Structure 1
């Protein structure tokens, strides 16, 4: 129960499309790579000066240890060589000096056989060695980590003015991926926020938005102090780099330091012969304790400093304006970047005998045919998705709900969301819903104004107690408010009442589209069915009872608190499959693995038996969030749990489980070779594009699928990896099943980027966050919904 099934076959269904994946062919030898561990004298050091130290070391020990040989360096504690150093395997101490004295230690750790990697790529070995991948990646990263500024898995460089005292930098993501019979170099383009190489005296003017310096409070000092504290600066009156720790209250004119107290102005006047044209401005507290103060005039901001401070609205907007590119642009500039590749003249790449193809990889894709969408009414219209999108016009819900009793709680200020607004909104909404097959019969039996979160619970309690058969409460909100979270908390977990929140700006002005989507959400929330997949147009999987599960875990920031990770698992409740039930669990901080999964799956199965009056003969389980290195872990526990949930349900019940992982967190971009295939303004690949060759895993069952229409930028094709399969799916059947499951998402009239169960799981998970706001098992009750909410699709 810990070995993923091999690729059963390749796919044939769909229309052929000629693509180009941003992968580049790598030719690697079968040599043994020698791995050494390093340790520098200052255990805490910037990863750049570590590289400088290492290269200085390699250069200054050419007659004793190194020579023609060039070792690649991880940046932390790992060094790699193509051939064994004349060191043996015992620790060796070497002194290195820099324009300071460093003492490094090198010791052999292991050997990295590329032959094993070759066997893995050929299928001789079922599993791929990780150390090989890591080593190769280090080799590829060495030089660009020296010539450029490494951030995560990307590299950045300068020459873009933003204007927030910061600049925008462009760069490229680079990783190494195993393929069939070969390794691939994955290059993609990216950008990030940096600090502009400025003189501090102008950085002040940018931060406070003074036009220049000629325009001469305490708050002005504080706001600058926040932005500058923690950054590095360089001396211009000699070179030497420091780190800003604070900003003065005493200007250089009236600041003193040791003993005879000399003023910074007078000190720079006597010692540094500087006029100091700005004697009145604050002084940069540098180092610590001991006074080391330097005025703004002599200080410049060092280049290459990344920003972490959350971006201003204008920063984000401007950056998107300066990053927004259609697929052909990204493609062309990636090609442009690999025109400058020249990996065959990079001495470190040459060292390990590696070659890289300077042209993008040609992969062949198949555009799957979209499923037919069935609607209800007496029209019984059948919608056909064109380019991943169909329409909600001249069509009625498959199963429309009659809203007989509903209320309106407006938490927006009465002045901004007036009565005429509410009345008109009601009229239009009732029209749209009437045409949608979800007739809102009468006027709202209740429509009042409220304010603050504290009014939520007493109000809803009044609504539920007073009005018989209350189905829905429409909640008008004045933008971002704690009122939303309170409304969801009370409505979903406390009282069990259906809820639709609406922004006031969407009430002030009517839009048939917005009202339509609103009606979708309302209909679903009230227990209705918007549409179903055409039963005739479905894979044979549905010939037997089958349940579809989705699962997702979200985590709090890594730095703090007992803040728990929350796991959500949803499951289909019909053989369409349209209706889903949700289960939530609070679990240990930062653990990407579902522990209570057995109980949750048990609950979902029990609900399935209560609904269909059948037992699922198959279990199609989509899970999102799990990365590669976690597979063996996840697949070990969760799978068992599922089986546990099957064996503890009844005595000999063991349905065929299909464990599939979904990820968008990758840089695999697919482009059109034929410009006539480019869809839309962004020129992305058509919805339904499937790739299962060339750039995929050499042994195991996985495939790329882009099931959505790309509106802006470059599409992110979802990657699917099959970790288990008792049902023994063929490639085509599973790809098609996934594609059609992408069409069962109720919140819109589109095919989304991932299957509906995973998406729902994400929604429920995100909802739990709102449920938690204002000891483990205490408010683990906070994420549990009401008895009248359990079986509902409350999660929008």
Structure 2
């Protein structure tokens, strides 16, 4: 149980909106919940649905009547009236009654408040409404897809775009709502394994050179196919499927396995020879490796040429850079375009004609729910210099033109390390970028004075550490190294490992293409990062517009955790907590840890908060009387456990610091990872080419929680596609914020982000936490272990208190 919504907000200008939420009308009835268990039970959900379907259609007069039950594909089945089964395990499948779920109770929860929304009742409603979809389409998380028909969008690397939709049912202010959004995700093309391989290795003619793969080629191919299912072609249309657990180092020609004889003895056989003796198949590519499938001890190896990628597998592995861009061009669409697609999808699903939805007397509205939101007023920013200019945000954006940093750092001692080849970045071009940067930096109050003390060309990652060591040895007062990089490169991680964690030196990296073509905007943005890295302040919130929380010392924290990529289970999850270090709030310090893979709870949270509080005290000489904690979204089903642990840890950090130190805690989870979309009802209110809602629009009624304290705030200007409004859930509040105070404060924090003169989509602290976690992933790049991983992530004392993550 979270705190109750204290009231609704009154600040700002009302704006009429439409939300991809569709009203659901449920009957006030009892539904009946049965358990099904099937043997074997390691089987995919699509199989179980087949079994249950076969069962329903066949055993009508015996044990089903003419009812239309609904099934989740696993263990749960629901019916609108009781089955003539009583209380009996009927029989490879059995059914036995479990419980009654009350939709009457769910209705009352929504208009009363006094009990938590009953999740078993919501679950039964969801299963019922997605039952037909689950048979017609391929289910993926809470979404549905079908194979490309009438379109084709390959991504490269054996991947392609499938279009589909997200569907979920959620309790809202007075009613259950159906949330529908259009969606698109990457799937693997169903094609032979050899063609998959050629795509991922960029081989244009596999018959050109019949020689084994290089080690790099095999490694690259391996990371790509590991975990996928494949099916075999050499058996008479049997087409047995397997999962890939590895790719052999040896060609099929050289790969051996113990061949078991009828007697039970074993002889050594090669894969190539086996396929000849057994299937009378002489391999075309005995130089290519095999797929190891099944257990890593059952020695089962498949030559590539007898294998196809199984149709219909989603790509969980991360997309590359092109891949991602390619996908966005095919999938993104303006707010109005998306708005039409949702509505068309909605009109074309005909939910009220779904005979399952009818069986349960459920009704859904055809039209997007209308909602009134409010556009919050944007805070003004205070700049420095002799004019002390103000910036007034306009549609979520302002600029540095005519403005000096609130506190600008003078830069007299700085170096250039150019890791791009000299021919691609010659001294004259380098001097040109340098001259430009200096003019711009001087205009911003952060003058880079004179010539660099050191400017040298190098190549490769291995050269970073010796050069940086020399630099630290020779210029112990070096303020900055500008590192020039040739595109994406392993030296970046090396520069950050060496500068952030080994030696404690500030570095600002810049792509050579940006050095070669100096745009004013780009150089100006570089100054923003450089100034704070060197301990400057770019701007502050004009102080009089702040929350009453600033009457006393207050600290703002942001927290995030990043998990290792799919496949990786070895690599750790990373936890990051940042905290404000002044009263503006502008400057932040960071803490970071490594922990058990996949754990969402921030395990060292108490330790981490304690460090931040101690550092806050060192810097301001006050103890905060309040702690405002912004937590990145977690999985809904785990957040009671998350909250219980983390709220206690934060409390513990205070308690373990000093007797009688009890600051008030506000704990807010921020979620961008959801499918709620908001559109202007009035065409004329749409902003930009993308036609999105204005930066600052806030919604805290109608589509939000029926009794708890949550709101949507779209803090940023929509540049492309359809904006995602961030969702804020208040899980704890000792500080008794009113709605306005907390919505305004959250919005203001989106204007304190140092890396751009724009309101960003989440508060600065939460955003910095993400950056910090991402930087630590670079520190771990390696090119006893648990103690070694913790050390790799610990940054040097000389940068530990700086904003190295900007």
Q: Same fold by TM (over 0.5)?
A: yes
1:145 corresponds to 2:143: no
Q: After TM superposition, give the deviation of residue 479 of structure 1 in Å.
A: 2.1
Alignment of 1:569-718 (within 5 A): 569-718=577-726
Distance 1:789 1:287 in 2: 47
Distance 1:554 1:371 in 2: 31
SS in structure 1 at match of 2:352? coil
Pair 454,41 (structure 1): closer, same or farther in 2 beyond 3 Å: same
Q: After TM superposition, give the deviation of residue 314 of structure 1 in Å.
A: 5.8
Could you say which residue in structure 2 is the equivalent of 1:41? Answer: 39
**Match of residue 20, structure 2, among 15, 19, 22:** 22
Deviations 1:714-754 (A, max 9, x none): 11111000011111000011000000000000011101000
Pair 219,185 (structure 1): closer, same or farther in 2 beyond 3 Å: farther
Q: After TM superposition, give the deviation of residue 333 of structure 1 in Å.
A: 0.7
1:493 corresponds to 2:482: no
Could you say which residue in structure 1 is the equivalent of 2:164? Answer: 171
Pair 262,5 (structure 1): closer, same or farther in 2 beyond 3 Å: closer
Distance 2:63 2:426 in 1: 82
Cα pair 1:228 1:244 within 8 Å, conserved: no
Distance 1:612 1:763 in 2: 24
Cα pair 1:341 1:358 within 8 Å, conserved: no
Farther-moved stretch of structure 1 (541-550 vs 12-21) = 541-550
SS in structure 1 at match of 2:802? coil
Q: After TM superposition, give the deviation of residue 476 of structure 1 in Å.
A: 1.1
Q: After TM superposition, give the deviation of residue 458 of structure 1 in Å.
A: 2.3
Pair 15,243 (structure 1): closer, same or farther in 2 beyond 3 Å: same
1:504 corresponds to 2:495: no
**Match of residue 746, structure 2, among 715, 734, 738:** 738
Pair 308,696 (structure 1): closer, same or farther in 2 beyond 3 Å: closer
Q: After TM superposition, give the deviation of residue 219 of structure 1 in Å.
A: 6.5
Could you say which residue in structure 1 is the equivalent of 2:185? Answer: 192
Pair 237,657 (structure 1): closer, same or farther in 2 beyond 3 Å: closer
Deviations 1:221-249 (A, max 9, x none): 99999899966669999986543789998
Distance 2:209 2:652 in 1: 73
1:550 corresponds to 2:558: yes
SS in structure 1 at match of 2:424? coil
Distance 1:295 1:520 in 2: 52
Pair 57,287 (structure 1): closer, same or farther in 2 beyond 3 Å: farther
Could you say which residue in structure 2 is the equivalent of 1:136? Answer: 125
1:446 corresponds to 2:454: yes
Distance 2:510 2:794 in 1: 24
Q: After TM superposition, give the deviation of residue 456 of structure 1 in Å.
A: 2.0
Q: Tell me, which stretches of 5 or more residues in structure 1 are unaligned?
A: 94-102, 266-277
Distance 1:202 1:492 in 2: 43
Pair 670,293 (structure 1): closer, same or farther in 2 beyond 3 Å: closer
Cα pair 1:553 1:625 within 8 Å, conserved: no
Farther-moved stretch of structure 1 (320-329 vs 722-731) = 320-329
Pair 325,115 (structure 1): closer, same or farther in 2 beyond 3 Å: same
Pair 176,378 (structure 1): closer, same or farther in 2 beyond 3 Å: same
Pair 258,678 (structure 1): closer, same or farther in 2 beyond 3 Å: closer
SS in structure 2 at match of 1:430? helix
Distance 1:18 1:625 in 2: 27
Deviations 1:349-375 (A, max 9, x none): 111121111111111110001000110
Cα pair 1:35 1:78 within 8 Å, conserved: yes
Q: After TM superposition, give the deviation of residue 84 of structure 1 in Å.
A: 2.2
Cα pair 2:188 2:312 within 8 Å, conserved: yes
Pair 293,760 (structure 1): closer, same or farther in 2 beyond 3 Å: closer
Q: After TM superposition, give the deviation of residue 170 of structure 1 in Å.
A: 1.3
Pair 316,472 (structure 1): closer, same or farther in 2 beyond 3 Å: closer
Distance 2:195 2:707 in 1: 58
Return the TM-score normalized by structure 2.
Answer: 0.87
Pair 228,647 (structure 1): closer, same or farther in 2 beyond 3 Å: closer
Cα pair 1:569 1:582 within 8 Å, conserved: yes
**Match of residue 113, structure 1, among 99, 102, 118:** 102
Cα pair 1:264 1:294 within 8 Å, conserved: no
Cα pair 2:316 2:566 within 8 Å, conserved: no
**Match of residue 176, structure 2, among 154, 171, 183:** 183
1:475 corresponds to 2:483: yes
Farther-moved stretch of structure 1 (452-461 vs 544-553) = 452-461
Alignment of 1:387-466 (within 5 A): 387-466=395-474
Q: After TM superposition, give the deviation of residue 322 of structure 1 in Å.
A: 1.6
Distance 2:597 2:432 in 1: 48
Pair 517,309 (structure 1): closer, same or farther in 2 beyond 3 Å: closer
Alignment of 1:312-391 (within 5 A): 315-391=323-399
Distance 1:244 1:672 in 2: 49
Farther-moved stretch of structure 1 (615-624 vs 17-26) = 615-624
Q: After TM superposition, give the deviation of residue 496 of structure 1 in Å.
A: 1.4
Cα pair 1:244 1:285 within 8 Å, conserved: no
Could you say which residue in structure 1 is the equivalent of 2:796? Answer: 786
Pair 155,239 (structure 1): closer, same or farther in 2 beyond 3 Å: farther
SS in structure 2 at match of 1:788? helix
Pair 34,201 (structure 1): closer, same or farther in 2 beyond 3 Å: same
Aligned length: 768
Q: After TM superposition, give the deviation of residue 71 of structure 1 in Å.
A: 1.3
1:104 corresponds to 2:109: no
Could you say which residue in structure 2 is the equivalent of 1:535? Answer: 543
Distance 2:113 2:159 in 1: 52
Q: After TM superposition, give the deviation of residue 511 of structure 1 in Å.
A: 1.2
Pair 760,237 (structure 1): closer, same or farther in 2 beyond 3 Å: closer
Pair 258,478 (structure 1): closer, same or farther in 2 beyond 3 Å: closer
1:155 corresponds to 2:144: yes
Deviations 1:268-295 (A, max 9, x none): xxxxxxxxxx9x9x9x999999999999
Distance 1:582 1:245 in 2: 42
Farther-moved stretch of structure 1 (132-141 vs 557-566) = 557-566
RMSD: 3.7
Distance 2:374 2:560 in 1: 28
Cα pair 1:256 1:263 within 8 Å, conserved: no
SS in structure 2 at match of 1:17? strand
SS in structure 1 at match of 2:717? coil
Deviations 1:292-312 (A, max 9, x none): 999999x99886454567657
Pair 531,27 (structure 1): closer, same or farther in 2 beyond 3 Å: same
Deviations 1:611-648 (A, max 9, x none): 22222121111111323223322221222222222223
Could you say which residue in structure 2 is the equivalent of 1:6? Answer: 4
Could you say which residue in structure 1 is the equivalent of 2:70? Answer: 72
Could you say which residue in structure 2 is the equivalent of 1:777? Answer: 787
Q: Tell me, which stretches of 5 or more residues in structure 2 are unaligned?
A: 254-271
Distance 1:767 1:292 in 2: 39
Distance 2:595 2:276 in 1: 60
